[PDB]
Amino acid sequence: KIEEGKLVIWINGDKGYNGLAEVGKKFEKDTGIKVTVEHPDKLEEKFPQVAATGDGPDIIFWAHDRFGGYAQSGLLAEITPAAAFQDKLYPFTWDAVRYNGKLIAYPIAVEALSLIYNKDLLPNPPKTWEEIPALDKELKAKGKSALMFNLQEPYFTWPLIAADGGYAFKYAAGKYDIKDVGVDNAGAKAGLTFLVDLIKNKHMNADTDYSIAEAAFNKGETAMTINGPWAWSNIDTSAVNYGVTVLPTFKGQPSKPFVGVLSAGINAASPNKELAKEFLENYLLTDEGLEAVNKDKPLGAVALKSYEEELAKDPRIAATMENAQKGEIMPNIPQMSAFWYAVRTAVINAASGRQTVDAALAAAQTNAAANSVGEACTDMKREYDQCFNRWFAEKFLKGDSSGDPCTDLFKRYQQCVQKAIKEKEIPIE
Amino acid sequence: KIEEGKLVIWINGDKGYNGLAEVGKKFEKDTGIKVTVEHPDKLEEKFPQVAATGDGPDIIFWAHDRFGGYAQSGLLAEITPAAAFQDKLYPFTWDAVRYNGKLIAYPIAVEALSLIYNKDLLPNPPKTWEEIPALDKELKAKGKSALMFNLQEPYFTWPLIAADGGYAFKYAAGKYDIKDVGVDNAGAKAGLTFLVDLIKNKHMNADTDYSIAEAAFNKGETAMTINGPWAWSNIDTSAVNYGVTVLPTFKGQPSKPFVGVLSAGINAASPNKELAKEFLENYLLTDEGLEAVNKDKPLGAVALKSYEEELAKDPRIAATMENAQKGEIMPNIPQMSAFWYAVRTAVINAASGRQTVDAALAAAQTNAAANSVGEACTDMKREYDQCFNRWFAEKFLKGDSSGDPCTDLFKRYQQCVQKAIKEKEIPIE
Amino acid sequence: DKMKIWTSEHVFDHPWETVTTAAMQKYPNPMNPSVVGVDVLDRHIDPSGKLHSHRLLSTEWGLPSIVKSLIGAARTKTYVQEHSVVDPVEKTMELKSTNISFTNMVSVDERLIYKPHPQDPEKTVLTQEAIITVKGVSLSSYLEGLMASTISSNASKGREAMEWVIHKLNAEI
Amino acid sequence: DKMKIWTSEHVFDHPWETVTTAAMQKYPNPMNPSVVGVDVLDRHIDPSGKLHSHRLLSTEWGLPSIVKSLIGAARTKTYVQEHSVVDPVEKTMELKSTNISFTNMVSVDERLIYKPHPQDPEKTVLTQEAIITVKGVSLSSYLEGLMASTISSNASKGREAMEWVIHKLNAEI
Ligand SMILES: OC[C@H]1O[C@H](O[C@H]2[C@H](O)[C@@H](O)[C@@H](O)O[C@@H]2CO)[C@H](O)[C@@H](O)[C@@H]1O
Ligand SMILES: OC[C@H]1O[C@H](O[C@H]2[C@H](O)[C@@H](O)[C@@H](O)O[C@@H]2CO)[C@H](O)[C@@H](O)[C@@H]1O
Ligand code: NA
Ligand code: NA
C-alpha cells in the first residue's frame, strides 16, 4: 500500500535526516516528484512490520547487517546499478550489501565507533581499558565521571567483548557457520565481566542510555564516551573541544567493534522503483548530496570514492578507519537479528546485576538461534511468542481464555512469515 | 626350487644370448659365482609355468609389457637400486618397468620395429603401405617378392592395425581402461583388411613365420621385411647391404608399432637376490657389458645414458627411435597377456581366410578379457580350459570319463593362481 | 496399510501443565542445535475449546566441511510441518508432525501424546509412534522390492549372456 | 531363518547338454563386461560321478570417472566364489555362488539349477533363487532395526531437550 509518484524515505533519527531532506528538495525542484524523509522510533523493528503488509517507505536506510534478513524475507528489490556506477564506489562496500551474489542495497558510508574524549579534562586519553577505574577515582575527586556510554544497545559494549575473544558467527571458508557462536567463549566472558565490575565499582551505571551519555559528555560532566561519526555534530556546537581516537585495549589486544556500512534499500512493495534508483544514484550518491547529509551529521567514511578523497583529510574519519580496521565488518546473514537480541538482553542483565555474566551469556548463546524462518520477522516472532507463553500459562490453561491469543502481534507476524515463505519458496498444506 | 650360489638367466633366443654369456664369464672370473644363460623355446609362456612352482631362472628377460602380469602374480621381486644408479638410466625407461609405484625390473634397451629393405633391389623404399602391391607385380616380374615378414606373431602386424585407428586399451587420465578395447574399431578393421587383401592378391602368404622371412630376405629373394634391432646381425653377415627406415604409412598416417623396453626381472623364488642385483647393476648395465650383448645382437637404444650416447650415432638406432616415437609405448598392465592371444588368434584367421576380418576381430574384442585372476597364469588358464571344454563335451557328458580331466595342465595352473591369490591377498574357503 | 517402524512410552517427572508449557517453547535449545528456525503459522481455539497450533520447523543438517560450497549450489535446510492440539480440561497434548522437504520421495510421520500419569498427576506420560512411508509402501516392502527389480534384471542379463555364448558355441561346429 | 528376496524359473530353447557346456565357458562375454577374470580353483569328479567345479570370479565395477585415482587408493575389483555340480546321468547342473568381497558386512547368495524340460528334452529349465543376508538378519529386519536405533535415539535427545527447557522454565519463577 505505497503511493505512486512520491518518494518516502526512512532513516534512523541519529542519522542526518534534515540533510537528506535537503537532497530531496533539490530532487523535487528538478523532477517535481515530492520526497518525504521520516525518522520513526525503533525503525529496525518498524520497517519489517510495515514492509510485511506491503506498506512502508520506498527507501529504507540502515546498517547493512540487517539487510540480508530484509531481503530474504521478500522485502527488498534487487538493485541494478550500471557497471559504470559501481566503479564510482568502493567494491569493499558493494560486498557488505551483496547476498547470494545479488546486490540488495546501495552502500552509503562506512561507520565504526571511536573513543571521544574531552581534551580539557583528559590531556592524553587512556590507551588501556584497565586504566579507567583508576582514572575515575581521580576524576570523581575533581567532580566528574571518567566515561559514560550507551549501555543499552549491545553495539557499544560489543567492542569490549570481542576484544579478548568473542564473535557472532565463526567465519569458515567464505561462509559463516550459524552453528558456531562466540558469545559464550572465554574472553567474551572476561570482556563482559570487566564491564559489570565497572558498574559495581560505581564507575559506570547500568541505566545510562544514548541520550543520558550524550548529554553528560556534551555538558562536560564526563571525560570520555564511545560513539560514531554521527554524534560529532552535537559535540561541535557544545563548547567542548574533543578528540576521536582508538578504543582502549583489553588484555593488550585491540577493542574490536563491528563495522556497518549504512546502506539504502528499495522496498519490494514499491511502484516507484525507478524514481528511487535515480534519486539514490543521481542525487544522493554524489559529492553534492553526500555533503548535504554529512554537513547535518557526519557519515563516517563515504563509499563514494570521489567524496571519500575530499573527506579523509578529516583526522576523525582517519580514527574511524583505524578502529574500523581494528575490528570486523558486520555479517549481513539473516541470523543477525537473532544474534542482536541474544546479546542485547545478555548485557543489561549482567549490568543490572540480576543475572551474572556466565548465566546471561550462556543464555545468549542459545537465544541467538531464536530465528524465524523469515528472519526479517525474528523480532515480531519474539514479541508474539513472549505474549503467548505469558497467556497460555496465565490465562488458557487456567481456563480463562476469552478467545484466540495475542491476535495483533500475531496478525503482522503471520504476514511477514507468509511473505518470507514465498520468497524462500517452501511448500505447505 | 632354485639353487643358491649360481645364477641362471633366461632371455629369448632372438636376443643376443652368447653376448650376455660372455658378460657372465667376466662375472665368474671376478666373483667365482657361475652364471648360466639359457634361451628356452616359448619363454614368455615357459617362465610363468616354472615360476609358479618356485622353480625357474634367477633372472628373467622379456619385453616390459608382460612384467606387470608377472609381478602381480607374485613371481618378481621388487628391485631396489640406489638413487645414483637410477640417474645412470633414462627415467622414461624406469617408467615402463614401474607398476603401482614399485620398480619390478631393470630396463635394458628400447626396441621398436622398422622397415628393413634391400638397397640393391629397392633404390628408394616405398613410403606408402598402399604402393606395395604395385611394387610386388614389378618385383615378381624380375623373379622376387616385395615384402615378407612374420605373420604369426601379432607384434609384426600390429603397426599396420593401430595405423588408421586401433588400440589395446584406451589411456584415460593416467590409467588404462581395461573395459575399452580398440581391437574392434573402424580403422583397426581397415588395417587388418589391407593385410589379408595382400595375401589374397598373392602378394604375401599367411604361412610365413619369422625364420621363413628372415631366410628369404637375407637370401636376397625379397626386397623388404619388418623386424627389430636384433635381426640386423644376421643381415650383416649375409651379402645384402640394407637400410632401416620408417614404416610405410596407411591412409597417410604413420604406422604405429608398440614399443617395448627389454627389461630384466629377479625371480621371487630366488636365494641369490643380491648376486642378481650386482650382476645386473655392476656388470650388465655398463658400457662394457651392454656392448658385449649389442655386439652379438643389437639391443636397439640402450637405457644406459652413458652407452646410448656412444651408440645413437648409429643411423639405425636413429630409425628405430623415429619409429618408436611414431607409435605408443607398450602397457605393462596385467591384462596384456590376454590382449596378445586375442589379437594373435584374430590375425591368422583373417590371414588363412578361415574367419573374415569382422568376425575374427569382433572375437578378439571379447577374448581380450579372458584374463585369469593371476594374469601371469592367463596363458596356462587358456590351455587348461581349452582342454576341459574338449573333454567335458567329448568324454564326460557322453559318460566316458576315466578320472579327473586335463590333470597336468591343471596342476601348474592351480599353483600360479594360488600364488597369485596370496599376492593379491584374496580370502577363500 | 499400517507399519509403525517404532513406538515408545516414557515418563517425565513433571506435571503436565509444565511439560506442555515447556513443549510450546521447546526451541531453540542446546540439545537440538540443528533446529534453527521455528514459526507458528496459525493458531486457533476451536468450538470445543481445543488450542490448535500449526508450526513450521527449519532444520540445518550438520555437515560442516563443504557447507559453504554446498549451500551456494542448494539450500542446506530441511523443513518439517507440525500440528499440535491442547485440551485444557482433559489435559492432553497431541502432536502430529511430517517432514515437508522430501515428502514426494519419502515421508516420516511422528505422533506424540502427553497426558498426566494415571497413578500420579505430578508425573507426565509421553507415548510416541513413528511411521516411515518410503513410497506409501513400507520401508521394508520398498527395499525388498528393489532387490526384485535389480536381482531379476541382472538375472535377465545372464540369460542373454548364455544365449550369446551358446550362439557362438553352436556356431563352432 | 529363511527369506528368499527373489526366485525365478525360466526356459532356454536349447538342450541341457549344450546349455551346460555353454555355462562352463560363460565368461568372458559381451553381456557381462564387468567380469574380467574367471579361474577354476579346483575340480573333482566325486565317488558318485558328479563333476564338482569351484570357480572364482573377479568383477570390476563400472565407475569410470575417478577410477585412475580410486584404484591407487584401493582395488576396484569385487570377488565372488562359486560352486557347481554336474550329474551327467540325471542331467542336473547346480550352482551356488556367494560374493567373498564384503561378506563380513553382507552376503548375497544365488542358487541355480539346470535340468531338461519335463515336456521337451530339447528345452532346458532354469530355476533360480537369491538370498540377501545383511547381517545374517534379513535385509528387511536389519533396515527396520536401524530405524528403531536412530528413531529412538533422536527421541531420546528430544527428551533431554525437554528437561533442559523445563529446567530453564522452572528456574524462571
Ligand atoms: O544502536 C545505535 C547504532 O547501532 C546500530 O548497530 C546495530 C545493528 O546494526 C542492529 O542490527 C542492532 O540490532 O544492533 C546494533 C545495535 O545494538 C547501527 O549500525 C548504527 O547506525 C546505530 O547508530
Ligand atoms: O615375437 C617377437 C618379438 O615380439 C615381442 O613382443 C611381444 C610382446 O612383448 C609379448 O607380450 C607377446 O605376446 O606379444 C608380442 C608378440 O606378438 C617382444 O617384445 C620382442 O622382443 C620379440 O622379439
Ligand atoms: Na504425510
Ligand atoms: Na555365505
Author numbering:
A (entry chain A), B (entry chain A): 1 to 429
C (entry chain B), D (entry chain B): -1 to 171
Give the authors' words.
TRIAP1 (yeast Mdm35) and PRELI (yeast Ups) proteins reside within the IMS where they regulate phospholipid metabolism. Thus, lipid transfer proteins of the Ups/PRELI-family shuttle phospholipids across the IMS in a phospholipid specific manner. The partner protein TRIAP1/Mdm35 has an important role in mitochondrial import and folding of the PRELI domain as well modulating its membrane affinity. The Ups/PRELI lipid transfer proteins are widely conserved in eukaryotes and can be classified into two subfamilies by sequence similarity (Ups1/PRELID1 and Ups2/PRELID3).
PRELID3b (previously known as SLMO2) is the human homologue of Ups2 and can functionally replace Ups2 when expressed in ups2Δ yeast cells. A variety of expression constructs were explored to supply suitable reagents for crystallography, including histidine tags on either TRIAP1 or the PRELI domain for purification and a maltose binding protein fusion (MBP) for crystallisation. The structures of PRELID11–173–TRIAP1 and PRELID3b–TRIAP1 were solved by molecular replacement and refined to 1.98 and 2.91 Å resolution, respectively. PRELID11–173 exhibits the most closed of all the structures while the structure of PRELID3b displays the most open entrance to the lipid binding cavity, and this likely contributes to its ability to readily accept the larger headgroup of PS. Mass spectrometry (MS) identified that a fatty acid, likely an endogenous E. coli lipid molecule, was bound to PRELID1 and the abundant E. coli phospholipid phosphatidylglycerol (PG) was present in PRELID3b. However, the overall hydrophobicity in this region is significantly higher in Ups2/PRELID3b than in Ups1/PRELID1, which harbours additional charged residues in this region. PS release, on the other hand, involved a more extensive overall interface of the protein surface on the membrane at the point of lipid release, consistent with the increased hydrophobicity of the Ω loop in the PS-specific Ups2/PRELID3b proteins.
